[PDB]
């Protein structure tokens, strides 16, 4: 269609218009939990979950040279009982048939397969990652610190900014795409006003198909944490 | 979710987020055609078609006493080579599992079954009808003229206004529900400024389930016409 929007002030477990993949679920307490927990609510190793909004977004139209804008606002928090929590949460855009790739329960954030994770020609993923785990022994593509990144068909972010994950604290995020400037902008803020900004010039018509779904992905490998989405609103208009 | 909106400036045959029922289709020339035509494009007898937007609207929430507003704007035109064309087109709201009932290809507008069409206790349909056929020999519930009506769980409109269908002319329609006044308002206009207004007080929480789908229905029995939707935008916010 020419435009689509939705808003979740909170999520409820009855929500009809989201697609859960892997370990993702909306809890009975109204939190969207992307990764698995044991019966005590403790995060566990080797888990991946994603959610997609069910309606399919017209990101661009080849026969008319129309391109959509979009704006995605959301808030999340992460918790872990241990040091060096992993692996992170991402807002992402992918073809509507997208599924969790094998080998992605870890630093690939549920978004990529190991043999092609850095191969821009192979992937169909645009993502904004909140990447808490950076160890060189397995995340060779990361800078040596937790970071916010924009991922264009690769797990190696096109651009990153330094970000110190705060245990249990809500981060508020606004992601916007402007097709006239071909700019994808991210602004994230913690409650004290600390602000994180990352932006990339990217022509969405060369990185993604005409129809897409939007959503979130998270994963934990050998290190773990809960990945908790509290709210989400989205709008897209084909211009 | 807490809100949802979409817009079709035009329809395209590739549209991913609509559900076609019966004879409905979006043509290669970008018109949403609800009822069947022969190979020359001529309307035919005994046809019914409906479309639904795929995303499910939260019309109300019982555990929080929240009720949604909504606003639906659309335009349509009807064509027939013969006199007394039939049967009409309706915007409607129904449970998400809704399907064309048997016996509805005619004056029941694809919305009701003959034995219960006037039984408010049985149905789950809220509709705004543009009803072109009124013959007492089969449409006993209609006034003796073409009319615009608001249908609350019955094919006998709660309220009607006189309307002379114009062959091939676009009618523009705005339908709005205000939950604070429990008022469903319809305003329709022809290109010369002729205006049709109909409004009913109705508590949507007593006539429809908490989750619904929205869309359009049309049918032809022994008399026929094409039922052509040109554009449609919709918004709903749970208050
Ligand atoms: C504690 O294990 C760390 O070091 C191991 C090698 O000594 C790695 O195999 C291991 O990587 C896995 O877990 C990390 C952290 O969750 C994850 O990013 C990666 O994709 C693997 O699943 C880890 O770095
Ligand atoms: C030309 O047929 C008209 O009169 C018949 C009886 O003499 C009716 O059976 C017939 O009704 C069917 O067609 C109408 C018009 O399309 C429709 O409204 C009704 O639901 C029946 O399908 C028609 O009135
Ligand atoms: C990257 O993926 C493309 C598409 O399959 C492939 O042609 C190319 O060989 C890959 N690059 C490498 C280094 O394997
Ligand atoms: C109307 O439908 C209700 C619900 O099934 C039913 O109880 C009632 O008998 C019907 N009324 C008539 C007149 O048949
Ligand atoms: Ca990482
Ligand atoms: Ca009628
Ligand atoms: Mn990273
Ligand atoms: Mn009528």
Coordinates of C-alpha atoms and ligand atoms in Angstrom, one line a residue:
Chain A
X1 CA 0.0 0.0 0.0
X2 CA 1.0 3.7 -0.2
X3 CA 1.4 4.0 3.6
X4 CA 1.2 2.0 6.8
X5 CA 1.6 2.8 10.5
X6 CA 1.1 1.1 13.8
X7 CA 1.9 1.8 17.5
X8 CA 2.5 -0.4 20.5
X9 CA 2.4 1.8 23.7
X10 CA 2.8 -1.6 25.3
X11 CA 2.7 -5.2 23.9
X12 CA 0.1 -7.7 25.0
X13 CA 0.4 -11.5 24.7
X14 CA -2.8 -11.5 22.6
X15 CA -1.3 -9.4 19.8
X16 CA -2.6 -10.6 16.5
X17 CA -0.3 -8.7 14.1
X18 CA 3.2 -9.9 15.1
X19 CA 5.0 -13.0 13.9
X20 CA 7.2 -14.7 16.5
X21 CA 10.4 -16.6 15.3
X22 CA 12.7 -18.7 17.4
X23 CA 12.5 -18.0 21.1
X24 CA 10.6 -14.7 20.9
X25 CA 7.4 -14.2 22.9
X26 CA 5.4 -11.5 24.6
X27 CA 5.2 -12.2 28.2
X28 CA 2.2 -12.2 30.5
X29 CA 3.6 -9.0 32.1
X30 CA 3.5 -7.1 28.7
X31 CA 7.2 -7.3 27.8
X32 CA 8.3 -8.6 24.4
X33 CA 11.1 -11.0 25.2
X34 CA 13.3 -12.0 22.3
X35 CA 15.5 -14.6 23.9
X36 CA 14.9 -17.7 26.0
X37 CA 14.9 -17.8 29.8
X38 CA 14.8 -20.7 32.3
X39 CA 11.9 -21.2 34.6
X40 CA 13.3 -18.6 37.0
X41 CA 13.5 -16.0 34.3
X42 CA 17.2 -16.2 34.0
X43 CA 18.7 -15.7 30.5
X44 CA 20.3 -18.8 29.0
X45 CA 23.0 -19.6 26.5
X46 CA 22.4 -20.4 22.8
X47 CA 19.1 -18.7 22.0
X48 CA 17.7 -16.6 19.2
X49 CA 14.4 -14.9 18.7
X50 CA 12.9 -12.4 16.3
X51 CA 9.5 -10.7 15.8
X52 CA 8.1 -9.2 12.6
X53 CA 5.1 -7.0 12.1
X54 CA 2.8 -9.1 9.9
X55 CA 1.8 -6.4 7.3
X56 CA 4.2 -6.1 4.4
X57 CA 5.8 -2.7 3.8
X58 CA 6.2 -1.3 0.3
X59 CA 9.7 0.0 0.6
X60 CA 10.1 1.0 -3.0
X61 CA 8.3 0.5 -6.4
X62 CA 10.5 -0.2 -9.3
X63 CA 8.1 0.6 -12.1
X64 CA 7.3 4.1 -10.7
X65 CA 10.7 5.0 -9.1
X66 CA 8.9 5.6 -5.8
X67 CA 10.8 5.1 -2.5
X68 CA 9.4 5.0 1.0
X69 CA 10.4 7.0 4.0
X70 CA 10.1 5.3 7.4
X71 CA 10.4 6.1 11.0
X72 CA 10.7 3.5 13.8
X73 CA 10.6 4.5 17.5
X74 CA 11.1 1.9 20.2
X75 CA 12.5 1.3 23.7
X76 CA 14.3 -1.7 25.2
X77 CA 16.3 -2.9 28.2
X78 CA 18.7 -5.7 28.8
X79 CA 19.4 -7.7 31.9
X80 CA 22.0 -10.4 32.9
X81 CA 23.3 -11.8 36.2
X82 CA 26.9 -12.0 34.8
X83 CA 29.7 -9.9 33.3
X84 CA 30.2 -9.4 29.6
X85 CA 26.5 -10.0 28.6
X86 CA 25.7 -11.0 25.0
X87 CA 24.9 -10.7 22.3
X88 CA 22.6 -7.8 21.5
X89 CA 19.3 -6.6 19.9
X90 CA 18.7 -5.1 16.5
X91 CA 15.9 -3.4 14.7
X92 CA 15.9 -4.9 11.2
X93 CA 14.3 -4.9 7.7
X94 CA 14.3 -8.0 5.5
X95 CA 12.2 -9.6 2.8
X96 CA 8.8 -10.8 4.0
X97 CA 9.9 -14.5 3.8
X98 CA 12.8 -14.0 6.2
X99 CA 13.6 -16.7 8.7
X100 CA 16.3 -17.2 11.3
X101 CA 19.4 -18.5 9.5
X102 CA 21.3 -21.4 10.9
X103 CA 24.3 -20.5 13.0
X104 CA 23.0 -17.1 14.0
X105 CA 22.4 -17.7 17.7
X106 CA 25.3 -15.6 18.9
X107 CA 27.2 -12.6 17.5
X108 CA 25.3 -12.8 14.2
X109 CA 22.3 -11.5 16.2
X110 CA 19.9 -13.8 14.5
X111 CA 20.4 -11.9 11.2
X112 CA 23.2 -13.7 9.3
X113 CA 24.8 -17.1 8.5
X114 CA 28.4 -17.6 9.4
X115 CA 29.9 -18.2 5.9
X116 CA 28.3 -15.1 4.4
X117 CA 27.8 -12.7 7.3
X118 CA 30.2 -10.1 5.9
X119 CA 29.3 -10.7 2.2
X120 CA 27.2 -7.7 1.2
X121 CA 26.4 -9.3 -2.1
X122 CA 24.7 -12.3 -0.4
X123 CA 22.5 -10.7 2.3
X124 CA 19.1 -8.8 2.3
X125 CA 19.2 -7.2 5.7
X126 CA 19.2 -3.6 6.9
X127 CA 19.6 -3.3 10.6
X128 CA 20.4 -1.0 13.5
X129 CA 22.2 -3.1 16.1
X130 CA 22.8 -2.6 19.9
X131 CA 25.8 -4.9 20.2
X132 CA 26.9 -5.7 23.7
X133 CA 29.6 -8.4 22.9
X134 CA 32.7 -7.7 21.0
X135 CA 35.3 -10.4 21.9
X136 CA 37.9 -10.9 19.1
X137 CA 37.8 -14.6 19.6
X138 CA 34.5 -14.8 17.8
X139 CA 33.2 -11.3 16.8
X140 CA 36.2 -10.4 14.6
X141 CA 34.2 -7.7 12.8
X142 CA 33.4 -5.7 15.9
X143 CA 35.3 -2.8 17.5
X144 CA 36.7 -3.6 20.9
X145 CA 33.7 -2.2 22.9
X146 CA 29.9 -2.3 23.0
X147 CA 28.5 -0.2 20.3
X148 CA 25.5 0.9 18.3
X149 CA 25.8 0.2 14.6
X150 CA 24.1 0.4 11.2
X151 CA 24.4 -2.9 9.3
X152 CA 24.0 -2.8 5.5
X153 CA 23.9 -6.5 4.3
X154 CA 26.8 -7.3 6.7
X155 CA 27.3 -8.0 10.4
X156 CA 30.3 -5.6 10.1
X157 CA 28.5 -2.3 10.7
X158 CA 29.0 0.4 8.0
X159 CA 29.4 2.8 11.0
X160 CA 29.4 2.5 14.8
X161 CA 29.4 4.6 17.8
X162 CA 30.7 3.7 21.3
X163 CA 27.9 2.7 23.7
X164 CA 28.2 1.4 27.3
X165 CA 25.3 -0.9 27.9
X166 CA 23.6 -0.1 31.2
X167 CA 22.1 -3.0 33.1
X168 CA 18.3 -2.9 33.3
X169 CA 18.1 0.7 31.9
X170 CA 15.6 1.6 29.1
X171 CA 17.2 3.0 25.9
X172 CA 14.9 5.0 23.7
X173 CA 15.6 4.9 20.0
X174 CA 14.4 6.7 16.9
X175 CA 15.4 5.3 13.5
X176 CA 14.5 7.4 10.4
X177 CA 15.0 6.9 6.6
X178 CA 14.8 9.9 4.3
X179 CA 14.7 8.8 0.7
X180 CA 15.4 12.3 -0.8
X181 CA 18.8 12.4 1.0
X182 CA 19.1 8.5 1.1
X183 CA 20.1 8.9 4.8
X184 CA 19.3 6.4 7.5
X185 CA 19.6 8.2 10.9
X186 CA 19.7 6.6 14.4
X187 CA 19.3 8.6 17.6
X188 CA 19.3 6.8 21.0
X189 CA 19.0 8.3 24.4
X190 CA 19.4 7.1 28.0
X191 CA 17.2 8.7 30.7
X192 CA 20.0 11.1 31.7
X193 CA 20.1 12.7 28.3
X194 CA 23.2 10.8 27.1
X195 CA 22.7 10.6 23.4
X196 CA 24.0 8.3 20.6
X197 CA 23.8 9.2 16.9
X198 CA 24.8 7.2 13.9
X199 CA 23.9 7.8 10.3
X200 CA 24.7 6.3 6.9
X201 CA 23.9 7.2 3.3
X202 CA 22.3 4.2 1.8
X203 CA 20.0 3.7 -1.2
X204 CA 17.5 1.2 0.0
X205 CA 16.5 0.3 -3.6
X206 CA 19.9 -1.4 -4.0
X207 CA 20.0 -3.3 -0.7
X208 CA 16.5 -4.7 -0.2
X209 CA 13.6 -6.0 -2.3
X210 CA 10.5 -3.8 -3.0
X211 CA 8.4 -5.5 -0.3
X212 CA 9.8 -6.0 3.2
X213 CA 8.9 -6.8 6.8
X214 CA 10.2 -4.9 9.8
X215 CA 10.9 -6.1 13.3
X216 CA 13.6 -7.0 15.9
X217 CA 16.1 -9.8 16.4
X218 CA 18.3 -10.8 19.3
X219 CA 20.5 -13.7 20.3
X220 CA 22.8 -15.1 22.9
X221 CA 25.7 -17.5 22.3
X222 CA 28.0 -18.7 25.1
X223 CA 27.3 -15.4 27.0
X224 CA 23.8 -14.3 27.6
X225 CA 21.2 -11.7 28.7
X226 CA 17.5 -11.0 28.3
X227 CA 16.5 -8.7 25.4
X228 CA 13.3 -6.9 26.3
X229 CA 11.3 -4.6 24.0
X230 CA 8.9 -2.3 25.9
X231 CA 7.2 -0.3 23.1
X232 CA 7.3 0.3 19.3
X233 CA 5.7 2.6 16.8
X234 CA 6.4 2.6 13.0
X235 CA 5.3 4.6 10.0
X236 CA 6.2 4.3 6.3
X237 CA 5.0 6.3 3.4
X238 CA 5.8 5.5 -0.3
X239 CA 6.8 8.8 -1.9
Chain B
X1 CA -2.0 -3.0 18.7
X2 CA -2.8 0.5 20.0
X3 CA -3.2 2.0 16.6
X4 CA -3.1 1.1 12.9
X5 CA -3.4 3.0 9.7
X6 CA -3.0 2.5 5.9
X7 CA -3.7 4.3 2.7
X8 CA -4.3 3.2 -0.9
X9 CA -4.1 6.2 -3.2
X10 CA -4.7 3.5 -5.8
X11 CA -4.7 -0.2 -5.6
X12 CA -2.3 -2.5 -7.4
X13 CA -2.8 -6.1 -8.3
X14 CA 0.4 -7.0 -6.3
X15 CA -1.1 -5.7 -3.0
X16 CA 0.2 -8.0 -0.3
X17 CA -2.0 -6.8 2.6
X18 CA -5.6 -7.5 1.3
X19 CA -7.6 -10.7 1.5
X20 CA -9.9 -11.4 -1.5
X21 CA -13.1 -13.4 -0.9
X22 CA -15.5 -14.7 -3.6
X23 CA -15.2 -12.8 -6.9
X24 CA -13.2 -9.9 -5.6
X25 CA -9.9 -8.9 -7.4
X26 CA -7.7 -5.9 -8.2
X27 CA -7.6 -5.5 -11.9
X28 CA -4.5 -4.9 -14.1
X29 CA -5.8 -1.2 -14.6
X30 CA -5.6 -0.6 -10.7
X31 CA -9.4 -0.8 -9.9
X32 CA -10.6 -3.0 -7.1
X33 CA -13.5 -5.0 -8.6
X34 CA -15.7 -6.7 -6.1
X35 CA -18.1 -8.6 -8.4
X36 CA -17.6 -10.9 -11.4
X37 CA -17.6 -9.8 -15.0
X38 CA -17.6 -11.8 -18.3
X39 CA -14.7 -11.7 -20.7
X40 CA -15.9 -8.4 -22.2
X41 CA -16.0 -6.7 -18.7
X42 CA -19.8 -6.8 -18.5
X43 CA -21.2 -7.4 -15.0
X44 CA -23.0 -10.8 -14.5
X45 CA -25.7 -12.2 -12.4
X46 CA -25.2 -14.1 -9.1
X47 CA -21.8 -12.9 -7.9
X48 CA -20.4 -11.8 -4.5
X49 CA -16.9 -10.5 -3.5
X50 CA -15.3 -9.0 -0.5
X51 CA -11.9 -7.7 0.5
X52 CA -10.5 -7.4 4.0
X53 CA -7.4 -5.6 5.1
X54 CA -5.2 -8.3 6.5
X55 CA -4.1 -6.6 9.8
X56 CA -6.5 -7.2 12.6
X57 CA -7.9 -4.0 14.3
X58 CA -8.3 -3.8 18.1
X59 CA -11.7 -2.3 18.2
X60 CA -12.1 -2.5 22.0
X61 CA -10.4 -4.0 25.0
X62 CA -12.6 -5.6 27.6
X63 CA -10.1 -5.8 30.5
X64 CA -9.2 -2.0 30.3
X65 CA -12.5 -0.6 29.0
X66 CA -10.7 1.0 26.0
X67 CA -12.6 1.6 22.8
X68 CA -11.1 2.6 19.5
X69 CA -12.0 5.4 17.2
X70 CA -11.8 4.9 13.5
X71 CA -12.0 6.8 10.2
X72 CA -12.4 5.2 6.8
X73 CA -12.2 7.3 3.6
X74 CA -12.9 5.7 0.2
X75 CA -14.2 6.3 -3.3
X76 CA -16.1 4.0 -5.6
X77 CA -18.2 3.9 -8.8
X78 CA -20.8 1.5 -10.2
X79 CA -21.6 0.6 -13.9
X80 CA -24.3 -1.4 -15.6
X81 CA -25.6 -1.7 -19.1
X82 CA -29.2 -2.1 -17.9
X83 CA -31.9 -0.5 -15.8
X84 CA -32.4 -1.2 -12.1
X85 CA -28.8 -2.2 -11.3
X86 CA -28.0 -4.3 -8.3
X87 CA -27.2 -4.9 -5.6
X88 CA -24.8 -2.5 -3.9
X89 CA -21.5 -2.1 -2.1
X90 CA -20.8 -1.8 1.6
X91 CA -17.9 -0.8 3.9
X92 CA -18.0 -3.3 6.7
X93 CA -16.5 -4.4 10.0
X94 CA -16.7 -8.1 11.1
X95 CA -14.7 -10.6 13.2
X96 CA -11.3 -11.5 11.6
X97 CA -12.6 -15.0 10.7
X98 CA -15.4 -13.6 8.6
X99 CA -16.4 -15.4 5.3
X100 CA -19.0 -14.9 2.7
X101 CA -22.2 -16.5 4.0
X102 CA -24.3 -18.8 1.9
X103 CA -27.2 -17.2 0.2
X104 CA -25.7 -13.7 0.3
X105 CA -25.1 -13.1 -3.5
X106 CA -27.9 -10.6 -3.9
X107 CA -29.7 -8.1 -1.6
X108 CA -27.9 -9.4 1.4
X109 CA -24.8 -7.7 -0.1
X110 CA -22.4 -10.6 0.8
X111 CA -22.9 -9.8 4.5
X112 CA -25.8 -11.9 5.8
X113 CA -27.5 -15.3 5.5
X114 CA -31.2 -15.3 4.6
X115 CA -32.7 -16.9 7.7
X116 CA -31.0 -14.5 10.1
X117 CA -30.4 -11.4 8.0
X118 CA -32.7 -9.3 10.2
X119 CA -31.8 -11.0 13.5
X120 CA -29.6 -8.5 15.4
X121 CA -28.8 -11.2 18.1
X122 CA -27.3 -13.5 15.5
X123 CA -25.0 -11.3 13.4
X124 CA -21.5 -9.7 13.9
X125 CA -21.5 -7.0 11.2
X126 CA -21.3 -3.3 11.3
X127 CA -21.7 -1.8 7.8
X128 CA -22.3 1.3 5.7
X129 CA -24.3 0.3 2.6
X130 CA -24.7 1.9 -0.8
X131 CA -27.8 0.0 -1.8
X132 CA -29.0 0.4 -5.3
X133 CA -31.8 -2.3 -5.4
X134 CA -34.9 -2.1 -3.4
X135 CA -37.6 -4.3 -5.1
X136 CA -40.2 -5.4 -2.6
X137 CA -40.4 -8.9 -4.2
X138 CA -37.0 -9.8 -2.6
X139 CA -35.6 -6.8 -0.5
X140 CA -38.6 -6.5 1.9
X141 CA -36.4 -4.6 4.4
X142 CA -35.5 -1.7 2.1
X143 CA -37.3 1.6 1.5
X144 CA -38.7 2.0 -2.0
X145 CA -35.6 3.8 -3.5
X146 CA -31.9 3.5 -3.7
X147 CA -30.3 4.6 -0.4
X148 CA -27.3 4.9 1.9
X149 CA -27.7 3.1 5.2
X150 CA -26.0 2.1 8.4
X151 CA -26.5 -1.6 9.2
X152 CA -26.1 -2.7 12.8
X153 CA -26.2 -6.6 12.8
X154 CA -29.1 -6.5 10.3
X155 CA -29.6 -5.9 6.6
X156 CA -32.5 -3.6 7.6
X157 CA -30.6 -0.4 8.1
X158 CA -30.9 1.4 11.4
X159 CA -31.1 4.6 9.4
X160 CA -31.1 5.4 5.7
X161 CA -31.0 8.5 3.5
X162 CA -32.3 8.7 -0.1
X163 CA -29.6 8.4 -2.7
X164 CA -29.9 8.3 -6.5
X165 CA -27.1 6.2 -7.9
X166 CA -25.3 7.9 -10.8
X167 CA -24.0 5.6 -13.5
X168 CA -20.2 5.6 -13.7
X169 CA -19.8 8.6 -11.3
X170 CA -17.3 8.5 -8.3
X171 CA -18.9 8.8 -4.8
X172 CA -16.4 9.9 -2.1
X173 CA -17.2 8.7 1.4
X174 CA -15.9 9.4 4.9
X175 CA -17.0 7.1 7.7
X176 CA -16.0 8.0 11.3
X177 CA -16.6 6.4 14.7
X178 CA -16.3 8.6 17.8
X179 CA -16.3 6.4 21.0
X180 CA -16.8 9.2 23.4
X181 CA -20.2 10.0 21.7
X182 CA -20.7 6.4 20.5
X183 CA -21.6 8.0 17.1
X184 CA -21.0 6.4 13.7
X185 CA -21.1 9.2 11.1
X186 CA -21.2 8.8 7.3
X187 CA -20.7 11.7 4.8
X188 CA -20.8 11.0 1.1
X189 CA -20.4 13.5 -1.7
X190 CA -20.8 13.5 -5.5
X191 CA -18.6 15.8 -7.6
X192 CA -21.2 18.5 -7.8
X193 CA -21.3 18.9 -4.0
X194 CA -24.4 16.9 -3.5
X195 CA -24.0 15.5 0.0
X196 CA -25.5 12.5 1.9
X197 CA -25.3 12.3 5.7
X198 CA -26.3 9.4 8.0
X199 CA -25.4 8.9 11.6
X200 CA -26.3 6.4 14.3
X201 CA -25.5 6.1 18.0
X202 CA -24.0 2.6 18.5
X203 CA -21.9 1.1 21.2
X204 CA -19.4 -1.0 19.2
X205 CA -18.6 -3.0 22.3
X206 CA -22.0 -4.6 22.2
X207 CA -22.2 -5.3 18.5
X208 CA -18.7 -6.6 17.5
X209 CA -15.9 -8.7 19.1
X210 CA -12.7 -7.0 20.5
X211 CA -10.7 -7.9 17.4
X212 CA -12.1 -7.2 13.9
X213 CA -11.1 -6.8 10.2
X214 CA -12.3 -4.0 8.0
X215 CA -13.1 -4.1 4.3
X216 CA -15.8 -4.0 1.6
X217 CA -18.4 -6.3 0.2
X218 CA -20.6 -6.2 -2.9
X219 CA -23.0 -8.6 -4.7
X220 CA -25.4 -9.0 -7.6
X221 CA -28.4 -11.4 -7.7
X222 CA -30.7 -11.4 -10.7
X223 CA -29.9 -7.8 -11.5
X224 CA -26.2 -6.7 -11.8
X225 CA -23.6 -4.0 -12.0
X226 CA -19.8 -3.7 -11.4
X227 CA -18.7 -2.5 -8.0
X228 CA -15.5 -0.6 -8.3
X229 CA -13.4 0.7 -5.4
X230 CA -10.8 3.3 -6.5
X231 CA -9.1 4.3 -3.2
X232 CA -9.2 3.7 0.5
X233 CA -7.5 5.0 3.6
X234 CA -8.2 3.9 7.2
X235 CA -7.0 4.8 10.7
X236 CA -8.0 3.4 14.1
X237 CA -6.6 4.3 17.6
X238 CA -7.5 2.5 20.8
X239 CA -8.4 5.2 23.3
Ligands
LIG1 C1 32.9 -17.9 26.3 O1 33.0 -18.2 24.9 C2 33.6 -17.2 24.1 O2 34.8 -17.6 23.5 C3 34.6 -18.8 22.7 C4 35.9 -19.3 22.2 O3 36.9 -19.3 23.3 C5 33.6 -18.5 21.6 O4 33.4 -19.7 20.8 C6 32.3 -17.9 22.1 O5 31.6 -17.4 21.0 C7 30.2 -17.8 21.1 O6 29.6 -17.0 22.1 C8 29.7 -15.6 21.8 C9 29.1 -14.8 23.0 O7 27.8 -15.1 23.2 C10 29.0 -15.2 20.5 O8 29.2 -13.9 20.2 C11 29.5 -16.1 19.3 O9 28.7 -15.9 18.2 C12 29.5 -17.6 19.7 O10 28.2 -18.1 19.8 C13 32.6 -16.7 23.1 O11 33.1 -15.6 22.4
LIG2 C1 -35.5 -10.1 -11.6 O1 -35.7 -10.8 -10.4 C2 -36.2 -10.0 -9.3 O2 -37.4 -10.6 -8.8 C3 -37.3 -12.0 -8.5 C4 -38.7 -12.5 -8.1 O3 -39.6 -12.2 -9.2 C5 -36.4 -12.1 -7.3 O4 -36.2 -13.5 -6.9 C6 -35.0 -11.4 -7.6 O5 -34.2 -11.4 -6.4 C7 -32.9 -11.7 -6.6 O6 -32.2 -10.7 -7.3 C8 -32.3 -9.5 -6.6 C9 -31.7 -8.4 -7.5 O7 -30.3 -8.7 -7.8 C10 -31.6 -9.6 -5.3 O8 -31.7 -8.4 -4.6 C11 -32.1 -10.7 -4.4 O9 -31.3 -10.9 -3.3 C12 -32.2 -12.0 -5.3 O10 -30.9 -12.5 -5.5 C13 -35.2 -10.0 -8.2 O11 -35.6 -9.1 -7.1
LIG3 C1 29.8 -13.3 -1.6 O1 28.5 -13.7 -2.1 C2 28.4 -13.7 -3.5 C3 26.9 -14.0 -3.8 O2 26.7 -15.4 -3.7 C4 29.4 -14.6 -4.1 O3 29.3 -14.5 -5.5 C5 30.8 -14.3 -3.7 O4 31.7 -15.4 -4.1 C6 30.9 -14.2 -2.2 N1 32.2 -13.7 -1.8 C7 33.1 -14.5 -1.2 C8 34.4 -13.9 -0.8 O5 32.9 -15.7 -1.0
LIG4 C1 -32.4 -14.6 16.4 O1 -31.2 -15.2 16.6 C2 -31.1 -15.6 18.0 C3 -29.6 -16.1 18.2 O2 -29.5 -17.4 17.6 C4 -32.1 -16.7 18.3 O3 -32.0 -17.0 19.7 C5 -33.5 -16.2 18.0 O4 -34.4 -17.3 18.1 C6 -33.6 -15.6 16.6 N1 -34.9 -14.9 16.4 C7 -35.8 -15.5 15.6 C8 -37.0 -14.7 15.4 O5 -35.6 -16.6 15.0
LIG5 CA1 29.0 -8.5 18.6
LIG6 CA1 -31.2 -3.7 -1.3
LIG7 MN1 28.7 -5.1 16.1
LIG8 MN1 -30.8 -1.4 2.1

